[PDB]
Write a protein that holds these residues in place. Sequence first.
Motif, mmCIF file in Angstrom:
data_model
loop_
_atom_site.group_PDB
_atom_site.id
_atom_site.type_symbol
_atom_site.label_atom_id
_atom_site.label_comp_id
_atom_site.label_asym_id
_atom_site.label_seq_id
_atom_site.Cartn_x
_atom_site.Cartn_y
_atom_site.Cartn_z
ATOM 1 N N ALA G 167 10.560 -19.172 19.701
ATOM 2 C CA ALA G 167 10.693 -20.240 18.707
ATOM 3 C C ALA G 167 11.400 -19.697 17.475
ATOM 4 O O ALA G 167 11.105 -18.577 17.065
ATOM 5 C CB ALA G 167 9.299 -20.800 18.315
ATOM 6 N N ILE G 186 0.786 -12.746 23.940
ATOM 7 C CA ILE G 186 1.246 -13.411 22.729
ATOM 8 C C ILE G 186 0.160 -14.363 22.194
ATOM 9 O O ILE G 186 -0.299 -15.295 22.863
ATOM 10 C CB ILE G 186 2.559 -14.178 22.989
ATOM 11 C CG1 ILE G 186 3.645 -13.211 23.512
ATOM 12 C CG2 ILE G 186 3.006 -14.903 21.718
ATOM 13 C CD1 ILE G 186 4.976 -13.889 23.968
ATOM 14 N N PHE H 44 5.647 -16.981 27.896
ATOM 15 C CA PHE H 44 6.268 -16.188 26.837
ATOM 16 C C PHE H 44 6.841 -16.974 25.674
ATOM 17 O O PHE H 44 6.361 -16.831 24.551
ATOM 18 C CB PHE H 44 7.329 -15.336 27.489
ATOM 19 C CG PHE H 44 6.877 -14.776 28.811
ATOM 20 C CD1 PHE H 44 5.961 -13.741 28.854
ATOM 21 C CD2 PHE H 44 7.324 -15.313 30.006
ATOM 22 C CE1 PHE H 44 5.517 -13.229 30.075
ATOM 23 C CE2 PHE H 44 6.883 -14.808 31.231
ATOM 24 C CZ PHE H 44 5.987 -13.758 31.257
ATOM 25 N N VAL H 45 7.862 -17.794 25.921
ATOM 26 C CA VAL H 45 8.388 -18.654 24.850
ATOM 27 C C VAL H 45 7.334 -19.694 24.415
ATOM 28 O O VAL H 45 7.231 -20.020 23.218
ATOM 29 C CB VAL H 45 9.696 -19.375 25.271
ATOM 30 C CG1 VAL H 45 10.139 -20.376 24.199
ATOM 31 C CG2 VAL H 45 10.799 -18.353 25.521
ATOM 32 N N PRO H 47 3.938 -19.926 23.964
ATOM 33 C CA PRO H 47 3.040 -19.689 22.820
ATOM 34 C C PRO H 47 3.765 -19.661 21.474
ATOM 35 O O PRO H 47 3.264 -20.217 20.503
ATOM 36 C CB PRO H 47 2.409 -18.320 23.128
ATOM 37 C CG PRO H 47 3.250 -17.718 24.231
ATOM 38 C CD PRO H 47 3.803 -18.886 25.001
ATOM 39 N N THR H 48 4.931 -19.046 21.398
ATOM 40 C CA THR H 48 5.608 -18.964 20.100
ATOM 41 C C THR H 48 5.976 -20.367 19.560
ATOM 42 O O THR H 48 5.909 -20.613 18.361
ATOM 43 C CB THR H 48 6.868 -18.058 20.174
ATOM 44 O OG1 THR H 48 7.936 -18.723 20.868
ATOM 45 C CG2 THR H 48 6.512 -16.718 20.871
ATOM 46 N N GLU H 49 6.328 -21.283 20.460
ATOM 47 C CA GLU H 49 6.682 -22.649 20.099
ATOM 48 C C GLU H 49 5.463 -23.437 19.607
ATOM 49 O O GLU H 49 5.536 -24.147 18.598
ATOM 50 C CB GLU H 49 7.297 -23.376 21.308
ATOM 51 C CG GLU H 49 8.677 -22.867 21.702
ATOM 52 C CD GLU H 49 9.283 -23.702 22.816
ATOM 53 O OE1 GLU H 49 8.592 -23.936 23.838
ATOM 54 O OE2 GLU H 49 10.441 -24.151 22.658
#
Lengths: 186, 186, 186, 186, 186, 168, 186, 186, 168, 186
Positions: G167, G186, H44-45, H47-49
């Motif tokens: 993100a 994460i 992976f992507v 959680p950050t979003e």
Amino acid sequence: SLINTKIKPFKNQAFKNGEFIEVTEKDTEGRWSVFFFYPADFSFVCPTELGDVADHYEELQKLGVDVYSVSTDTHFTHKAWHSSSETIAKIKYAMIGDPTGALTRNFDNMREDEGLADRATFVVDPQGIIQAIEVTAEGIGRDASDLLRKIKAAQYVAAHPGEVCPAKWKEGEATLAPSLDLVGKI
Amino acid sequence: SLINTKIKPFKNQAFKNGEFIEVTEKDTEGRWSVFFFYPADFSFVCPTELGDVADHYEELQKLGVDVYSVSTDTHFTHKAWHSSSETIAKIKYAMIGDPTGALTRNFDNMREDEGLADRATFVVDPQGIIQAIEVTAEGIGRDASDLLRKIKAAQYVAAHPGEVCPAKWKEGEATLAPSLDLVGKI
Amino acid sequence: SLINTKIKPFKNQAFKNGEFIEVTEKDTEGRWSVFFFYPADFSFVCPTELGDVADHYEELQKLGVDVYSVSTDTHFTHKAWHSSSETIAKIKYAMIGDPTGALTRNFDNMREDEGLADRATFVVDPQGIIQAIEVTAEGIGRDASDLLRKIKAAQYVAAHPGEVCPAKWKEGEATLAPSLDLVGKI
Amino acid sequence: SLINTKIKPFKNQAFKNGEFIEVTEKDTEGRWSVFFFYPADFSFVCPTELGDVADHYEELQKLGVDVYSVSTDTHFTHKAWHSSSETIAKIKYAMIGDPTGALTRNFDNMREDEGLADRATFVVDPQGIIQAIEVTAEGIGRDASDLLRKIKAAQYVAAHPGEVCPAKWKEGEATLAPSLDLVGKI
Amino acid sequence: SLINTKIKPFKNQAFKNGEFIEVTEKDTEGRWSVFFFYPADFSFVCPTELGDVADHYEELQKLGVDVYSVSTDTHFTHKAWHSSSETIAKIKYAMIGDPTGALTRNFDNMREDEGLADRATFVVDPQGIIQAIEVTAEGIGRDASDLLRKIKAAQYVAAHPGEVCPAKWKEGEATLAPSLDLVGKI
Amino acid sequence: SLINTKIKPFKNQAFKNGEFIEVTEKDTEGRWSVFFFYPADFSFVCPTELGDVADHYEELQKLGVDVYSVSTDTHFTHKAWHSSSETIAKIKYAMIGDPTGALTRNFDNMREDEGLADRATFVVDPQGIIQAIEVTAEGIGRDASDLLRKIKAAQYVAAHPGEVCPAK
Amino acid sequence: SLINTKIKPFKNQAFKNGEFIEVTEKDTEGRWSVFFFYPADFSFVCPTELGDVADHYEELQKLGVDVYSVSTDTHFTHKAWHSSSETIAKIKYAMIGDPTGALTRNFDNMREDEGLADRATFVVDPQGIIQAIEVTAEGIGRDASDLLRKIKAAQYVAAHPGEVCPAKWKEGEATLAPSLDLVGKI
Amino acid sequence: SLINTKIKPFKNQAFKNGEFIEVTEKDTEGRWSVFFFYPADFSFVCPTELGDVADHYEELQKLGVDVYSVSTDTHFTHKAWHSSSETIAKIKYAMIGDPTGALTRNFDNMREDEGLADRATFVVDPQGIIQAIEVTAEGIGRDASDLLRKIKAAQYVAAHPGEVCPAKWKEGEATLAPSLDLVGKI
Amino acid sequence: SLINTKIKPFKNQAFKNGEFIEVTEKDTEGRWSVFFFYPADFSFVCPTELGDVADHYEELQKLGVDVYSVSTDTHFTHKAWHSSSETIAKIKYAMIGDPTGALTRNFDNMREDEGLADRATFVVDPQGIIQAIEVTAEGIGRDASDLLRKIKAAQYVAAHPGEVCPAK
Amino acid sequence: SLINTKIKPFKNQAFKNGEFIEVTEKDTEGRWSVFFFYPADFSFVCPTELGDVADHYEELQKLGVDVYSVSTDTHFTHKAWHSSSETIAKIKYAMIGDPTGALTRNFDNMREDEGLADRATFVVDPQGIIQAIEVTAEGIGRDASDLLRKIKAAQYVAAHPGEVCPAKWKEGEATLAPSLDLVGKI
Ligand SMILES: [Cl-]
Ligand SMILES: [Cl-]
Ligand SMILES: [Cl-]
Ligand SMILES: [Cl-]
Ligand SMILES: [Cl-]
Ligand SMILES: [Cl-]
Ligand SMILES: [Cl-]
Ligand SMILES: [Cl-]
Ligand SMILES: [Cl-]
Ligand SMILES: [Cl-]
Ligand SMILES: [Cl-]
Ligand SMILES: [Cl-]
Ligand SMILES: [Cl-]
Ligand SMILES: [Cl-]
Ligand SMILES: [Cl-]
Ligand SMILES: [Cl-]
Ligand SMILES: [Cl-]
Ligand SMILES: [K+]
Ligand SMILES: [K+]
Ligand SMILES: [K+]
Ligand SMILES: [K+]
Ligand SMILES: [K+]
């Protein structure tokens, strides 16, 4: 409309200058053609329109334009009409009979509830492409001077690619030359 | 052809004299209408034809005839054209935009491979009936004097039932009175 | 064949004794009718056949039998023919025009590749039932005397149920009275 | 009607002059044929009609014409009828049995509610083409004199391509020669 | 097979003792019936089977059993057969004609490529249920005394529910009474 | 009916004289065959009919005629029945088991609401053609003497075609 | 959505830097492309969005990214707009006309009741695969800065398989390296 | 795209702030909603979003905006992830489980080959209408700053009917007022 | 599978303790039921399985559980088998005959190429819901002690819902 | 049920002993397999059943039996579950993720309204044929020692054709040898 479509194959009998002949799409190839539909032999507006075309027939032949009048009556009936009517008697072009309605339906021109063709005129180029269409109501006769203007405009465009004939165009008048620069200028 | 059929309902935006308006079939009821299709704003033949109609617009309004030009461009684009072209600037009739193509397809007048309307003109009476049709190829401009003659003939037939307008007919000319006796006489 | 079936509703224009009239199935209800189909006005066998029926028309009328001749030509064309042919001139019965072909197809009698009716004759009783059918090739004329014989046999059988008319029967001749006793005796 | 159509393949058993044989369409090839349908052995009108044809059989054979009578009864039943009826005993032509109804349905001549053929006669040329049809109601006997007149006209037009037989035509009488000049003159 | 199904409605003409009558399924209601099918009247096989049933008909009538012989021939043909054959002349039961084939097809007994019924016999009880079927090829005689045996068995079980008739059963022989204790005991 | 049609291929297990065997249409080729259907092992009319056919089986075999009884019970069940019933114990012909109902449906002979065959007998000639059919209601047993008479007539007409007595 | 699907073949006219050109899918092969749809030339939000992309076009070109703006207006109209609007005047990328709507429908992006494209942006990689999609309501302008971020993330991921952009990722920032060990951490 | 369409009825289980609840479309009625789809818990992507959205959640709640994250994982799995990930632990919005895929397919957002949702975000107004869409490839994380800008523009146009938000618009900046006079001027 | 679905209506004849009875779904209402399918009377694995269930039948009845064995053989055949086999003679539960295969197909349990049921056991609760299913190959007999264990677990969870041991 | 049918092709990701692997039907060929389905990772039920299979896995491997647990959760979720639960941590067999549901549907084991698999276990032999099935409701434990018993029986019959395993069979117990003499004997 059928504008810019190719005419369909057909095979019909016709009366022309005291003979019965067979006309097919092959007879129109490499020639300019006018298909002149009308509803009924022995009718009222129909003869006056046909006579109007007959008046111009010398001029049309000089332009290399053949005329085919078409109704759903038979060629026998055209012959009879040609000898009993003073107006029809002066017709020297082919009068096609279309009792099956096939030629009329090729041009999408049948009054289905009557079995008669509408008052439609189609201008057809040497490659079989319809370039101009006129259709009027039962009570409104056509005017051959308008036909001729359209034929001449059609012939000019054919012979001068990259040029188009603007509104009202007659021989000797200026033409438009489509291009990017001309876009939005007129 | 669509001759002698009723126009279909429609709803379109238009530019007219500095305003945006909505036109529908309701606006044509009880009026004579000309639907004047053309392929593209900012094109070449199209403006000259539109200008030709605009010249005659005073005469048309006197006959109680409304004009709707139609292309598949938007009404925004007509407005833009109206202010950038000296020819289009003189148009006082409604310029309809038909980006959905619905109005154009109602009149069966779409060039499907281009998304543009063909050069077709339809004369429509107060009851919504198409009385005259003219269609020309991309390169052949129309001539408003022929339109007017047909409109006048259409109006005469409407106002004089039992009479029909023969070929070439103009105001003051003789008409035909269909009857059994007249059959085969002309 | 269509034998012993009821005629279908129809509505056509006809030329009869200097007038245009409308004929429908209602005209035939309660009457004997002959539907006399032929391919083409101004043709060759057709006039001689129609004249032959005309020769018998006084008698047919005396017997309560109406005649309707039918071709796919128009009633306008029938009027013209009636005035230009001295054979057709003697016709006092209705000449129906069937340019839509609907009346012809009701009787399954269209030459589909020509748009002309075959030479077919149908005898229809007052209840609309087809009691006799004759069809001949394009070159083979019919003979009204045989038609009259069949009409009289049909009228006899309608008036004398329990009796039937043997081969070759004419008025005043022995009839057959169906019964178990008669089975296998002839 | 089936006029001017080709007869369909068939294979049926028949009684003829004291023996049982098979008949097929191949047997009709290159010959004139009459297919003479009737509803029922041992009935009333049927024998009189068959006898009437038998009375003409020598004349028919002289014209190269074969007769096939047809009912949905079996060939066994035809043989029995041929023995017990003095009328049927005179028959020297093939009596076809059609209990499957296939031959009868080929000629579209089945009374479906009864499983019996209608009174229909078909004249068929050497190429298999039906040139004359006659159908009469249950109570109405046919007349072989008319059959013979039609056969003779059919043979004449076959033998004289450029001529047609007008109404009433019989041997020795004037024929018509179709031409443009003859159009409308009769 | 059709065993234990109900007969279908039907309406046929028959010859019965010197008269023509109509038979429908209503005539079978409340009665025992035999439908005795066979292929063809006047065929080359001696009609011993029909004669055998005739021989037993007085007895069948005392048992309240009606007999209907059926073929696809007409009732006219049955009448002629009854006059011509000493064996058939013994028949006092109804001879049904089935030229439409509908009765034969109700019993799924049509030879479709011949239009004739197979040699099948059906025993039908007063509620219209089929209780016994026999079908044989030609030359394999249907024996009327086996039919009678099967009829008496069927009548016995109808009158004695809770009892069934073993193999070879005739009046006076022991019957079986279905029960749990009898399971696996015989 | 199925008269004058050819029997359809089939493959079933059977009990015959203390063995399990497979029977197919190939076993019937070149032989006269009787297909003798009945509704249910351990039932009532069924044994008496089967016993009646057994009484005639020597005679049938001398005429070159094979017998196949058929029900929708299994060949295991036929074996059990052949052991426990005095009547069925007499049977020396093949008892075909048809639990899928395929053989029974080939002869269009299933009682669909019961899963049992109707009381139908088919006489089948050496070419596989059905020459005689008899069907009786649940309550009505068949008679092997009529079957024998028909088989002999069928053999006679096969041997001497068109010696059917003329009509006068 | 159309995410991770391949663009469809197309062929359209476009206005680009004073010229009319043809654009097809072949122009996009081996290039990054932005297909930038908008509803209407001479409208309101559309110019501001197009100007915004133009502001970023130098950078897009440096990154090997082509831009194609698309509306259902014609390329003639794009030329006119480009000369009459000082915003549109700064556009150096291809302005595609899509009056047939085919390119718009390829991207499932037509407002069917308006005949105008929705405000949709598609990022297409050199293999023709759609990697990012943005669509906003008629009144909601897009923001080219966000588009540039997504283009850079897409280019990064293509150049670094085994890495993904979390993100908010921009150049020079930490990426994620998918692996079993990273699962759930994460 | 689904732009300007109404969301479909749904019923899903969710984890929210330590409990399991049901969410339906009724819960979105009269509220702004964000449906935030992602492919897989513990990846992976994703959680950050989600964390990025959680960072904006207080601001979103102040704008009356509810967030629903959606994956095809179960609500049980969301609860576990919420316990074991420090990023996901921060989430105070509903985490919807969609193992039937029905909610995901409602938004046409299923990767059918994977049984996982694509990275799509839908902004939905109080009437259920989708006003903004964003979709990115597997390897490309979204940026909640752009989400918030779009939400704010969507709320502004909703609250100010006669105004639209140009490109780049954020709170306090100039809007556009659509009108005829503004046509072509920008 | 059919797990957690409601049994379908049915009507079959059965042999039970020297009587023939009709069994329908109405007999199962308000009761625990075991539908115990097997392929063939007079066969091999089948008796040993049925005998095993019979050994447990008193225990099952004390748990309020009814047993219905089912094959596509007839109830006549079950009666015969119950008389001739020492193992089957022990059976006091209903032996359902299913010659139409309708009961077997309700449980989607037909071997279509054999006309016999597969070795399937269904445990059905008082509301008609299938709570346990076991199916084994032709060659593999079932074990009634596993069936009893499952029935008791099924009764326990019915009586005490959500007393399933928590996850840590 | 699926008893005695062959398993279908499949391709799924799995977690197995700290790595991600792909499993397909090729991995099962020549091996004995157990497909152990369950509804959901991280659900509130203790995963004793999976743990029980883990307890017996060394023994199953000695018997050449591979185990595949299957739910519709992802392999990512299995990995997290295996880290979070002491019971699941005992699992050294492959944990298949089936988010598309394809493997679950191959075994006709989907709860379509939940998107989760039912509690079903399938034993599959080296030729891919299903030899034993067990399905239970929640709380009705699948006992791993019953599974082992059924596996040993299935392996025994595979190794000893002509023998079958009676009820309660375990190694050392008598088997049955199908034969005619044994029919009805037990
Ligand atoms: Cl047209
Ligand atoms: Cl038109
Ligand atoms: Cl007819
Ligand atoms: Cl026609
Ligand atoms: Cl006909
Ligand atoms: Cl028939
Ligand atoms: Cl039958
Ligand atoms: Cl049969
Ligand atoms: Cl004799
Ligand atoms: Cl999309
Ligand atoms: Cl469009
Ligand atoms: Cl979308
Ligand atoms: Cl899914
Ligand atoms: Cl199941
Ligand atoms: Cl079945
Ligand atoms: Cl516990
Ligand atoms: Cl299963
Ligand atoms: K005509
Ligand atoms: K447009
Ligand atoms: K017949
Ligand atoms: K899932
Ligand atoms: K059975």
